[PDB]
């Protein structure tokens with residue numbers, strides 16, 4: 001019955017992907033950012049320059065105050081608000097209504113984005129990273145406890161809408177086989193990267209470096225984010241491969257955007273990136289390959305040029321690897337919480353390089369994969 005959920009997401013990589021939800025009685029409609037990197041369901045509940053609408057607890061007969069405050073910091077942005085519960089539904093999701101925890105956001109900093117068209121956030125990860133603590137049941141945990149919806153969801157983010165299939169896998173959204181990697185621990189959607197190659201060349205780092213201090217799958221982050229040492233090794237490699245042309249160093253910091261005459265972008269000089277993920281059987285892994293069309297994010301020209309301009313969508317991290325939206329775009333990603341694994345497959349909405357193709361390939365053999373986990 002998943003066909004009704006296809007295309008239930010709007011938005012872009014750089015603006016966030018959001019789904020429509022309703023809260024309260026009578027139902028109030030809000031667009032909610034879908035975020036696998038956190039575990040709090042929160043909505044603007046007070047006026048804000050960037051909000052065209054918000055949650056009004058006074059208008060809902062089913063609202064219940066929990067008389068407790070809450071604060072949530074992200075890599076960027078933060079808000080504080082008031083905990084309560086209310087009835088929640090997803091119009092283009094399963095046909096159910098659940099009582100869910102909701103943080104009513106009363107104050108925020110660098111959280112809401114001007115003209116993003118969303119007014120809240122849906123944290124899809126586990127209770128362990130919920131604020132104020134893990135006793136605040138996350139939305140998806142509530143959905144699964146209160147209804148018959150199976151304990152999984154999948155995401156198909158399409159670059160330049162998407163689909164969130166709640167409760168299953170829709171086989172028409174991907175081609176080829178699904179490959180699965182264990183969820184290392186149920187807090188973030190944490191996985192283990194066991195090898196990295198660039199244009200077929202092994203970075204040859206201690207694989208612990210790739211997962212220092214963790215690696216997570218996050219639909220709510222735009223970029224691929226890498227630990228300092230890995231980020232430096234990657235950028236060095238990508239520079240050398242594209243040394244044909246000259247780029248400002250502010251470009252490699254994701255600040256300045258480079259441009260080319262419409263339809264003349266030299267994709268071929270940028271390397272593919274292969275991330276190998278721990279697999280499901282002993283000494284086995286598989287790889288996802290990223291095309292430049294993914295880590296060069298298209299942006300509006302700062303001038304009156306009909307040129308194609310891009311930003312470098314790989315950035316340095318001090319909190320581990322983040323596989324963000326630009327990586328998830330062009331894969332179908334299955335968050336199989338029931339079997340503690342995450343699946344990847346080539347998306348039906350993948351980008352078309354002329355001579356290269358984004359791919360999910362296996363099996364590969366990799367000795368000692370356990371040693372790649374950071375402790």
Ligand SMILES: CCCCNC(=O)[C@H](C)C[C@H](O)[C@@H]1CSC/C=C/CS[C@H]2CCCN[C@H]2C(=O)N[C@@H](C)C(=O)N1
Nearest residue numbers: 014015016035037038074075076077111129220221222
């Ligand atoms: C409370 C413990 C869990 C905290 N989890 C995290 O911080 C995750 C690692 C990151 C989150 O997934 C977090 C959720 S979105 C918060 C809004 C930012 C405005 S910018 C945000 C929305 C527009 C598109 N770019 C996005 C982005 O790129 N956000 C990164 C920068 C980020 O921060 N994402």
